[PDB]
Amino acid sequence: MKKFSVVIAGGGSTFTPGIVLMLLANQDRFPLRSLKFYDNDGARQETIAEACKVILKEQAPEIEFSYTTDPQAAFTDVDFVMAHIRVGKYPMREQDEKIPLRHGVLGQETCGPGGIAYGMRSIGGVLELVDYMEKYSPNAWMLNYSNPAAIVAEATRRLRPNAKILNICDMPIGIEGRMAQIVGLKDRKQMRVRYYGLNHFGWWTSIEDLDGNDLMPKLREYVAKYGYVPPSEASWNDTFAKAKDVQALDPQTMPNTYLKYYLFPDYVVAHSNPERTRANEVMDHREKNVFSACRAIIAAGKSTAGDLEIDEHASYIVDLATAIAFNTQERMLLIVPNNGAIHNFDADAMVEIPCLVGHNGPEPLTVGDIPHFQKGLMSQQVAVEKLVVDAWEQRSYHKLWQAITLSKTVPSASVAKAILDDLIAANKDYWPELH
Ligand SMILES: NC(=O)c1ccc[n+]([C@@H]2O[C@H](COP(=O)([O-])OP(=O)(O)OC[C@H]3O[C@@H](n4cnc5c(N)ncnc54)[C@H](O)[C@@H]3O)[C@@H](O)[C@H]2O)c1
Ligand SMILES: [Mn+2]
């Protein structure tokens, strides 16, 4: 078995330790000779890196390890780039969430004007990583599990069409995990599914066990009463529960949880608090906890000084990496150019659909024609995403106003323009200039 060189772009991330623990738990299927951290925030990364340094010397001292702010040192001699950056960090996520809310619109990490703003910040950053990877490790694959993938994937499709980038999302993985528990299967890998949509905007059409038995009837009966809350944090519980109402709009399918923001934006605004948003919760909890536990590890010189555990969820990252590395043909939902897969939908749209993954990347499976309801929703939203990338590319104020105006989350062109002017003011150091 061969060994792999990985570089984590976003070393300063609070998820880095959990992901590293995950990788160490998967040395049997994905052996590593080298692990590197890269970040543009040195001081923030140093705390994470020095703590991970202790963990690595305990569990796997044969893995060569280093951290840096230098692209050349980071991207040289790697097989994979795991990109989980958050341009602007939590202070900007806080703005994304509160600015729309002062105008009576939902503020969310990847949906609505908040997500649009995060997408406008993220495009530039990701194009940089892609360029670094191609310059120092031309044969490397980038596993981009950063958000907001619908906007960033549309940018890379347009500007780096041939780059070896794999766009993947964990939301479907988490939902499938809950589905598996609801029907009573061991795990999600005991299911074979069909699905279509945009990232954070899709539907399961077929859900079966490996033998082909239909699991849909049981899921319908259950989700119709409790949503994706299986028989086994407050904000997420509500999202998973609200899927009850979202699934009700099309009883034949199962929906992606992000559809609640588009079908019930009123509900979201009503149950929000413009003083304390999700960013505030993470900042005062997960952010402070991980950095604290990391300084505790460095100061004590022992991992047990911290309470960092394996990030089980993140496992799907290794599934993707092994699929590429060992040409496994594993079936998974990836974000790829449509080009006929959804026959009655724009060829140049980025869609989240089943693909077989091998050494050449994905081989997407056809989907067929989709119904008017989903087609209408996706046509509206994909127009939003394409106008955002248009605004970015052409440095156009007017394209971004169009984009925000088109969103199902935005009540009118006048409110859209007010939100836009506030987002511009708040993102002065991250967005290109708009004329
Ligand atoms: N398993 C996971 O890591 C996971 C889970 C859910 C969502 N996400 C998504 O991944 C992204 C990262 O979120 P997170 O919570 O893991 O990270 P985080 O918010 O805990 O930290 C982000 C890190 O990325 C760094 N960064 C920002 N811009 C950069 C650039 N241009 N170059 C290099 N580094 C940069 C920041 O300095 C910071 O250290 C988000 O979009 C999030 O929605 C990741
Ligand atoms: Mn996602």
Numbering used by the authors: 1 to 232, 238 to 440
Question: Which lines from the publication concern this structure?
Answer:
Here, we report the deposition of 14 structures of enzymes from both the core and accessory genomes of sequence type 23 (ST23) K1 hypervirulent K. pneumoniae. Targets were selected using a shotgun approach aimed at uncharacterized metabolic proteins from ST23 K1 hypervirulent K. pneumoniae. In silico multilocus sequence typing of all K. pneumoniae isolates was completed using Kleborate. This analysis showed that 64 of the selected proteins are part of the K. pneumoniae core genome, defined as genes present in at least 95% of all strains; the other 132 proteins are part of the K. pneumoniae accessory genome and are overrepresented in the highly virulent hvKp clonal group CG23, which contains ST23 (7). Thus, the x-ray crystal structures presented here provide the basis for functional analysis of 12 uncharacterized proteins associated with high-risk K. pneumoniae infection.
Of these targets, 34 were successfully purified from large-scale preparations and entered crystallization trials. Fourteen structures were determined for 13 different targets as detailed in Fig. 1.
